[PDB]
Amino acid sequence: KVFGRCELAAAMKRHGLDNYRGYSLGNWVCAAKFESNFNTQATNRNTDGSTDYGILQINSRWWCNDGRTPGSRNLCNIPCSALLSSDITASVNCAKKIVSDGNGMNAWVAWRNRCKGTDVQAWIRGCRL
Ligand SMILES: [Cl-]
Ligand SMILES: [Cl-]
Ligand SMILES: [Cl-]
Ligand SMILES: [Cl-]
Ligand SMILES: [Cl-]
Ligand SMILES: [Cl-]
Ligand code: NA
């Protein structure tokens, strides 16, 4: 599913991301925009052989099992495929784990490089929330 901007903001809000670990909702929408273009089906291979999955591009090296990343962990206790669902519940729950790990939203390279320090409230402007 390819979400609209405000549709995703609402979904994220309902699943408790707004101000989760101090990150306002715009931060999460902005990260989703630049990680996946709001597409739950997005996948990208990494050089190490791990793959990033879903609207928040969650990596199989640590967070999900895809059966092809040897030596990796599955800290979210989910198949990576669960992260590609039109229902973002699994992605949001696993994102909460990641952002709690110590490095905050710096875990998301696109967040750090294109959202951090910017006017992220823009991403939820005009939305009914
Ligand atoms: Cl929308
Ligand atoms: Cl947009
Ligand atoms: Cl915001
Ligand atoms: Cl699994
Ligand atoms: Cl959803
Ligand atoms: Cl933080
Ligand atoms: Na894994």
Side-chain angles (χ1 to χ4, degrees):
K1 168 175 180 163
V2 182
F3 277 82
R5 178 176 59 85
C6 295
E7 189 186 11
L8 183 64
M12 292 179 154
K13 178 161 181 59
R14 165 171 83 86
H15 286 290
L17 285 184
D18 188 18
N19 308 308
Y20 188 88
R21 287 325 155 99
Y23 291 92
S24 68
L25 192 61
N27 280 291
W28 294 100
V29 172
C30 185
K33 173 71 176 179
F34 297 126
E35 287 293 352
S36 69
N37 209 18
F38 298 152
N39 184 9
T40 66
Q41 301 190 256
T43 63
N44 284 292
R45 179 81 104 155
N46 306 131
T47 48
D48 68 359
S50 62
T51 301
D52 294 344
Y53 294 90
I55 215 164
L56 292 164
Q57 290 290 275
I58 290 176
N59 185 269
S60 63
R61 175 68 50 203
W62 308 100
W63 304 108
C64 63
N65 179 51
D66 68 2
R68 64 165 204 196
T69 313
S72 74
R73 317 189 69 191
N74 183 7
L75 290 170
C76 292
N77 292 305
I78 48 161
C80 296
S81 65
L83 303 169
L84 308 177
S85 183
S86 62
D87 182 337
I88 71 174
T89 300
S91 282
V92 166
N93 285 346
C94 187
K96 287 179 177 171
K97 295 196 173 77
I98 300 165
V99 75
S100 296
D101 206 36
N103 287 344
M105 286 194 75
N106 299 292
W108 290 278
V109 65
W111 180 85
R112 183 171 81 230
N113 291 325
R114 309 180 70 177
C115 301
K116 189 177 184 179
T118 76
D119 178 22
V120 299
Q121 187 275 316
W123 295 95
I124 58 162
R125 212 110 88 203
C127 304
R128 200 158 26 218
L129 293 171

